[PDB]
Target: brain tumor CG10719-PA
Amino acid sequence: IKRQRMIYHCKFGEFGVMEGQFTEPSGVAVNAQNDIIVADTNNHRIQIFDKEGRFKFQFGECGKRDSQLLYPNRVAVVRNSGDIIVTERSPTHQIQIYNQYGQFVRKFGATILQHPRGVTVDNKGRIIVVECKVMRVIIFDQNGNVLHKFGCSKHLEFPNGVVVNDKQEIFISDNRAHCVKVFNYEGQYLRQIGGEGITNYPIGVGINSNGEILIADNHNNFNLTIFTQDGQLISALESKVKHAQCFDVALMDDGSVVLASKDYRLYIYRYVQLAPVGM
Model:
């Protein structure tokens, strides 16, 4: 399976505690304006940048009080409102909601969650959370009500990412299963996408505005493999560079994907030709 070569056109970040610097970019998400939202874990803050990697603003500070965060890992965006969903690591296993201006909205799930490892929001505003160490998926509404939850220790081994479509299907990247596992809101395993030799050791999963499923991995260089929701292989790319441990990926509309890694940086990769104007 040959893949097209891809190279990032933008990279930003460096070690630090100041604006635009990171300690650990554990989570990344993108809003409707293509702004890049990042969970800077050891700085207990969320940083927002424009589609070009330029710093816009930050919110959150170490603490356990409204507007404060404690080891934030992972973020998602409510597309229609610009609201930012944040999850806090195991110790403070809960989620928080901030609006597009960084104003605190609410927090909940501290007595429900345990090991949040992935989060996303569907087109109806529902918040989907996937947990490891106990393989479980929890679904909440904007107000913090548990709409449903199901275990999945029979189909998941090292969940590390999740996206959803508009037909109540949950796509979870499974690092040790070398693929993405698909389930429905009832918790039924439906099918898998990718597999050994195609999507080895996925580090995350993303979904296109076109509904395509993007599976990323850093097994021998950074690789991106694109599939339809039914599991049909459409494209395959690879970077000529091996990155530092990669934490998460997020899709931008315009054929781009953002990668967050342990080297205190985020890289933006073009995974499809933008086509000439007029064509």
The domain at 1-279 is CATH 2.120.10.30 (Neuraminidase). The chain has one domain: 1-279.
